Design an enzyme around this catalytic site. Structure first.
Site, PDB file in Angstrom:
ATOM      1  N   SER A 197       0.825  -1.197   0.000  1.00  0.00           N
ATOM      2  CA  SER A 197       0.000   0.000   0.000  1.00  0.00           C
ATOM      3  C   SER A 197       0.864   1.255   0.000  1.00  0.00           C
ATOM      4  O   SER A 197       0.310   2.361  -0.047  1.00  0.00           O
ATOM      5  CB  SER A 197      -1.029   0.007   1.129  1.00  0.00           C
ATOM      6  OG  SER A 197      -1.814  -1.197   1.139  1.00  0.00           O
ATOM      7  N   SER A 233      -5.265   3.462   4.442  1.00  0.00           N
ATOM      8  CA  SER A 233      -4.856   2.520   3.406  1.00  0.00           C
ATOM      9  C   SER A 233      -6.062   1.898   2.693  1.00  0.00           C
ATOM     10  O   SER A 233      -6.054   0.704   2.344  1.00  0.00           O
ATOM     11  CB  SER A 233      -3.922   1.477   3.979  1.00  0.00           C
ATOM     12  OG  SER A 233      -2.896   1.184   3.055  1.00  0.00           O
ATOM     13  N   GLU A 270      -5.741  -3.132  -6.252  1.00  0.00           N
ATOM     14  CA  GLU A 270      -6.038  -3.790  -4.991  1.00  0.00           C
ATOM     15  C   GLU A 270      -7.096  -4.850  -5.211  1.00  0.00           C
ATOM     16  O   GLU A 270      -8.066  -4.594  -5.928  1.00  0.00           O
ATOM     17  CB  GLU A 270      -6.641  -2.817  -3.981  1.00  0.00           C
ATOM     18  CG  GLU A 270      -5.648  -1.814  -3.460  1.00  0.00           C
ATOM     19  CD  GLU A 270      -4.702  -2.375  -2.416  1.00  0.00           C
ATOM     20  OE1 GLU A 270      -4.699  -3.629  -2.185  1.00  0.00           O
ATOM     21  OE2 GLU A 270      -3.976  -1.554  -1.825  1.00  0.00           O
ATOM     22  N   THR A 278       2.140   3.139   5.145  1.00  0.00           N
ATOM     23  CA  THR A 278       2.525   1.755   5.353  1.00  0.00           C
ATOM     24  C   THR A 278       2.200   0.923   4.134  1.00  0.00           C
ATOM     25  O   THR A 278       1.435   1.331   3.268  1.00  0.00           O
ATOM     26  CB  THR A 278       1.811   1.149   6.564  1.00  0.00           C
ATOM     27  OG1 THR A 278       0.406   1.329   6.348  1.00  0.00           O
ATOM     28  CG2 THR A 278       2.256   1.784   7.872  1.00  0.00           C
ATOM     29  N   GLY A 279       2.769  -0.284   4.112  1.00  0.00           N
ATOM     30  CA  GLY A 279       2.272  -1.308   3.223  1.00  0.00           C
ATOM     31  C   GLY A 279       2.472  -2.687   3.824  1.00  0.00           C
ATOM     32  O   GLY A 279       3.462  -2.935   4.502  1.00  0.00           O
ATOM     33  N   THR A 280       1.522  -3.574   3.548  1.00  0.00           N
ATOM     34  CA  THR A 280       1.527  -4.915   4.109  1.00  0.00           C
ATOM     35  C   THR A 280       1.033  -5.914   3.062  1.00  0.00           C
ATOM     36  O   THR A 280       0.162  -5.580   2.269  1.00  0.00           O
ATOM     37  CB  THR A 280       0.632  -4.968   5.348  1.00  0.00           C
ATOM     38  OG1 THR A 280       0.953  -3.879   6.222  1.00  0.00           O
ATOM     39  CG2 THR A 280       0.791  -6.295   6.058  1.00  0.00           C
TER      40      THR A 280
HETATM   41  C1  TSL Z   1      -1.649  -2.519   1.765  1.00  0.00           C
HETATM   42  O1  TSL Z   1      -0.480  -2.405   2.063  1.00  0.00           O
HETATM   43  C2  TSL Z   1      -2.227  -3.746   1.927  1.00  0.00           C
HETATM   44  C3  TSL Z   1      -3.489  -4.144   1.741  1.00  0.00           C
HETATM   45  N1  TSL Z   1      -3.823  -5.455   1.965  1.00  0.00           N
HETATM   46  C4  TSL Z   1      -2.961  -6.550   2.425  1.00  0.00           C
HETATM   47  C5  TSL Z   1      -2.686  -6.472   3.945  1.00  0.00           C
HETATM   48  O2  TSL Z   1      -1.939  -7.358   4.428  1.00  0.00           O
HETATM   49  O3  TSL Z   1      -3.217  -5.533   4.599  1.00  0.00           O
HETATM   50  C6  TSL Z   1      -3.528  -7.962   2.067  1.00  0.00           C
HETATM   51  C7  TSL Z   1      -2.440  -8.947   1.621  1.00  0.00           C
HETATM   52  C8  TSL Z   1      -4.403  -8.618   3.144  1.00  0.00           C
HETATM   53  S1  TSL Z   1      -4.647  -7.695   0.621  1.00  0.00           S
HETATM   54  O4  TSL Z   1      -6.134  -8.196   0.988  1.00  0.00           O
HETATM   55  O5  TSL Z   1      -4.132  -8.529  -0.495  1.00  0.00           O
END
Ligand code: TSL
Length: 266
Positions: A43, A101, A141, A210-212
């Site tokens: 993100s 996000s 996304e 952030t990003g995850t």
């Molecule tokens: C942004 O950085 C992330 C959004 N989504 C992800 C998260 O871990 O928060 C996922 C992998 C769950 S997304 O549904 O693919």
């Protein structure tokens, strides 16, 4: 000593790969660790995405109302899923994309840039315009968070994204009024308290996005200001390619990396 050793020790302790870049300044050397290795944006792309929309439109565009349905909520959208009936202005979407996000907000902002691939080509072009020949966005996304480690799509490098953020927040890529909007949204981010923010003393200002994602991906890009108001860009990116697609992301790894970096900068 050697900061690189202490980053390598973090990688061993967290069983993770870590990427760091802090651009050199008037009075400091760069900090680099795997800074030209690729990592998934996740993100973190939403900060430069908002900059692309700002860049391309007068500020009156921030009041443009975007309508959508519940079927458009295809990713984690804390804000957008509570405004399906009314819709959201481009400004509200910018706010949501950064501070919460918001996935749907990001998808709508991509659509706003327009063109093939739902705006992903346009976004990558904005980065090229800022001198980034490395980074690419290829999916919306939520798919962009879930490519396998070997996929170059949807990747950047700490080095590349840091130099993008430098330009946007501390440089002249945006006029002052568009810059202040981006700076403020990042400054009031709500998702970042356990990353770079947690590595810097409380008298330092921190703005971040952030990003995850999958394979233990945890990223944070920040601009920090010393207690005397001296600014630095900090990009930290991490993943756990050997831990499976469902490896747990480690916020504390980014917080410790950031502590190492604060020790250098203070
Ligand atoms: C942004 O950085 C992330 C959004 N989504 C992800 C998260 O871990 O928060 C996922 C992998 C769950 S997304 O549904 O693919």
């Amino acid at each position: 000593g050697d900061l690189a050793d202490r980053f390598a020790e973090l990688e061993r302790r967290y069983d993770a790969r870590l990427g760091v870049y802090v651009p050199a300044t008037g009075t400091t050397a760069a900090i680099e660790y795997r800074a030209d290795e690729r990592f998934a944006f996740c993100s973190t792309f939403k900060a430069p995405l908002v900059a692309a929309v700002l860049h391309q439109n007068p500020l009156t565009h921030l009041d443009k109302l975007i309508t959508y349905t519940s079927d458009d909520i295809r990713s984690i959208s804390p804000v957008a899923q509570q405004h399906v009936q009314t819709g959201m202005t481009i400004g509200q979407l910018c706010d949501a994309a950064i501070r919460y996000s918001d996935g749907t907000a990001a998808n709508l902002l991509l659509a706003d840039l327009g063109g093939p691939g739902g705006g992903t080509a346009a976004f990558t072009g904005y980065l090229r315009s800022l001198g980034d020949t490395v980074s690419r966005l290829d999916a919306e996304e939520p798919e962009l968070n879930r490519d396998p480690p070997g996929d170059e799509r949807n990747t950047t490098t700490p080095h590349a994204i840091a130099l993008v953020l430098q330009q946007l927040v501390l440089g002249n890529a945006l006029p002052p009024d568009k810059r202040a909007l981006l700076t403020d949204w990042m400054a009031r981010n709500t998702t970042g308290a356990k990353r770079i923010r947690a590595g810097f003393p409380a008298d330092w200002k921190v703005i971040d996005k952030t990003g995850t994602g999958d394979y233990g991906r945890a990223n944070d890009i920040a601009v920090v200001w010393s207690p005397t108001g001296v600014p630095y860009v900090v990009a930290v990116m991490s993943d756990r390619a050997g831990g499976g697609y469902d490896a747990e992301p480690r916020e504390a790894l980014l917080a410790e990396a950031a502590t190492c970096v604060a020790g250098v900068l203070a």
